[PDB]
């Protein structure tokens, strides 16, 4: 779950940035009643809460990832390069996908057909 | 947003050869030539009734500075059965060229046997009230005719607020025909 | 009696000569021969032939032009057949033609 930690933290940073984006967005829309709307303040608060959540989350994931679980890491250079169960799940997935595509094709044909008719005389 | 104008002989060459010069220029610009056109007019008593090839199911009757109703082709017959004419007819006839969304007609106006002049008709197909589009028409004609000149005729229609049908075209036609009969 | 017009053949574009089983008069399709030149070639081939040769010689050029235009489509281009250049007298444009 280590690489899982890496990816999830990565996504948490995007979540940070996007939350900040929407927070400033909500702030921009604000009105200062002239009204008694007050729902604005509600969204602002409960929005600001998630940011607080994600920061502690980032601290936790950072700690767990730089924990360095017995790793004598080589510097990136020389990494740029100038299990059967995976195969089984991949095969099952590809089969299920193919069946889904038969279904999608059938529905496409039905929709083309129903369209042809009705649009012809309805 | 039709525009009509009378291009002099500039003789120079003969009136047919003037038409030939215009044809050659307009073919040079890169415009395909479509089926011929023909507009003709008659005056009664004063009433003007005129036919056009762009509208071969409708014949337009116009009083100068008055009403201008369009009618069905069977309005000639009503004028026939109404004898209660002068044989001053006029009849333009020539080929129809087509530019990109842009139609331009040149003709040799004829009264009796003697062609009195050369009349050119340009109509930018997709258009609305001319007051907004006349810029583009001038932009084009300055290349084709502008040598002599085009001179804004849609002022015959630019006074209004906003409308344009096909009648004002034949109104301009009648104005030109009244101009070509008078002077030699 | 499809008839190819260019060496590396594309069945999609080559030429199709058809004979209407009810009338005998020939029927031609070429996928976009301007629909007027197709009519001209129609009347020719129907009259006598003896005439497929010159029209094949012209269709060769047409198909070349369309292949070039289609290739150049992707890029920025305004392809055309003729330019209105003054200097045709001595500059080599007169040579290649």
């Amino acid at each position: 779950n280590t690489a899982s930690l890496c990816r999830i933290g990565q996504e948490t940073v995007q979540d940070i940035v996007y939350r900040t984006m929407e927070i400033f967005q909500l702030l921009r829309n604000m009105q200062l009643p002239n009204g008694t709307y007050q729902d604005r303040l509600t969204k602002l608060q409960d929005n600001l809460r998630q940011l607080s959540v994600l920061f502690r989350k980032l601290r936790l994931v950072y700690d767990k990832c730089n924990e360095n679980c017995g790793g004598m890491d080589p510097i990136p250079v020389e990494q740029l390069i100038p299990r059967r169960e995976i195969a089984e799940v991949n095969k099952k997935l590809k089969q299920k996908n193919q069946q889904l595509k038969q279904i999608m094709d059938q529905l496409r044909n039905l929709i083309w057909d129903i369209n042809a008719m009705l649009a012809m005389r309805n | 947003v039709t525009c009509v104008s009378q291009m002099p002989v500039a003789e120079g060459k003969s009136v047919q050869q003037t038409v030939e010069l215009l044809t050659r220029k307009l073919e040079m610009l890169g415009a395909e030539k479509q089926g011929t056109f023909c507009v003709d007019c008659e005056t009664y008593h004063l009433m003007y009734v005129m036919h056009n090839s762009e509208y071969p199911l409708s014949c337009f009757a116009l009083f100068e500075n008055g009403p201008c109703l369009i009618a069905d082709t069977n309005f000639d017959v009503l004028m026939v059965k109404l004898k209660g004419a002068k044989a001053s007819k006029i009849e333009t006839r020539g080929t129809r060229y087509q530019y990109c969304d842009f139609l331009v007609k040149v003709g040799t106006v004829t009264m009796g046997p003697s062609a009195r002049g050369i009349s050119v008709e340009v109509e930018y197909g997709p258009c609305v009230v001319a007051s907004d589009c006349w810029s583009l028409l001038l932009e084009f004609l300055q290349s084709f005719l502008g040598s002599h000149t085009p001179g804004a005729p849609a002022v015959f229609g630019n006074r209004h607020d906003a409308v344009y049908g096909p009648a004002d075209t034949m109104v301009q036609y009648m104005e030109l025909f009244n101009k070509i009969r008078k002077q030699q | 009696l499809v008839v190819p017009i260019l060496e590396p053949c594309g069945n999609s574009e080559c030429l199709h000569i058809f004979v209407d089983l009810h009338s005998g008069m020939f029927q031609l399709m070429l996928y976009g021969l301007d629909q007027a030149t197709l009519d001209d070639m129609e009347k020719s081939v129907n009259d006598d032939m003896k005439r497929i040769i010159p029209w094949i010689q012209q269709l060769k050029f047409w198909l070349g032009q369309q292949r070039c235009k289609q290739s150049i489509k992707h890029l920025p281009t305004i392809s055309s057949e003729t330019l209105q250049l003054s200097n045709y007298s001595t500059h080599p444009i007169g040579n290649l033609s």
């Binding site: 595509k101 094709d105 496409r108 929709i111 083309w112 057909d113 369209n115 042809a116 008719m117 649009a119 012809m120 005389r121 | 479509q34 089926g35 056009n52 762009e54 509208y55 071969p56 199911l57 409708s58 337009f60 109703l69 369009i70 009618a71 069905d72 082709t73 069977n74 049908g165 096909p166 009648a167 075209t169 034949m170 | 499809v2 069945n11 999609s12 574009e13 199709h16 058809f18 004979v19 209407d20 089983l21 009810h22 009338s23 029927q27 399709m29 996928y31 489509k73 992707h74 890029l75 920025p76």
Partner: protein, 257 residues
């Protein structure tokens, strides 16, 4: 369990209707001389649209489903012909000139027609129309097949597709967006809008281009592959912006010869 007499009456009526349709079609065969040729034998009207395609319109007097749409449409077409004969559109609103098409009036006073507008009223036959549709269905089938087959054989830049929900008898439309496997939101150029029509596929590209692909399939294969390459090279720039890098950027077209 409607009365037995009604079953025989309706069967006979349908038999007469399909006889009438096939008669009309066989007439149009020896008639207007469609651009594609067509054989009529006695009860099978074989024709070729786009070559390698043989459309057979038959009459199975006793005593597919692609063309099932085509059949049910043909039926409505002939009944539209009949209705055109006797309809209110023919009826004159003013107690006046004869039974014109309610538009041939407006073809009068309202100076209406040039060659094109007047010609818009003339008819286009019955076999020509159905031939059109048949072609359209086929074309559409070929495009869907080649796009999905392209999707099957790559697994690098994914070719997502979304057909429309209003497919008219003449012309259909679809959107194709090619995206990178994970980065979608972030990166999205290379988007198209095919207009599949009878005998031509018009492509409108997000960048602003308008290419008119032919009715073949190799052409669409090639165009979509060109877009796939361009998309990889665009996705790298989008990613460099996504965060972290300055670009000494590309030529969409050229590279460096």
């Amino acid at each position: 369990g409607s009365p037995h007499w009604q079953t025989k009456l309706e069967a006979a009526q349908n038999v007469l209707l399909c006889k009438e349709i096939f008669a009309q079609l066989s007439r149009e065969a020896v008639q207007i001389k469609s651009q594609v040729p067509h054989i009529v034998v006695k009860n099978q009207i074989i024709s070729q649209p786009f070559p390698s395609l043989q459309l057979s319109i038959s009459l199975c007097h006793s005593s597919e489903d692609h063309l099932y749409v085509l059949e049910h449409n043909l039926h409505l077409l002939i009944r539209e012909f009949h209705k055109q004969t006797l309809s209110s559109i023919m009826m004159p609103h003013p107690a006046s000139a004869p039974f014109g098409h309610k538009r041939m009036r407006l073809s009068g006073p309202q100076a209406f027609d040039k060659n094109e507008i007047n010609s818009l009223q003339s008819s286009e036959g019955l076999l020509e129309k159905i031939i059109k549709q048949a072609k359209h269905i086929f074309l559409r089938s070929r495009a869907a097949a080649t796009i999905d087959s392209l999707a099957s054989r790559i697994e690098d830049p994914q070719i997502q597709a979304h057909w429309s929900n209003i497919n008219d008898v003449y012309e259909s439309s679809v959107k194709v967006l090619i995206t990178s496997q994970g980065y979608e939101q972030i990166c999205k150029s290379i988007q198209l809008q095919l207009n599949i029509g009878v005998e031509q596929i018009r492509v409108v590209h997000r960048d602003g281009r308008v290419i008119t692909l032919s009715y073949q399939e190799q052409e669409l294969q090639d165009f979509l592959l060109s877009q796939m390459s361009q998309h990889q090279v665009h996705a790298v720039q989008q990613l460099a912006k996504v965060m972290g890098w300055q670009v000494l950027s590309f030529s969409n077209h050229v590279g460096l010869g």
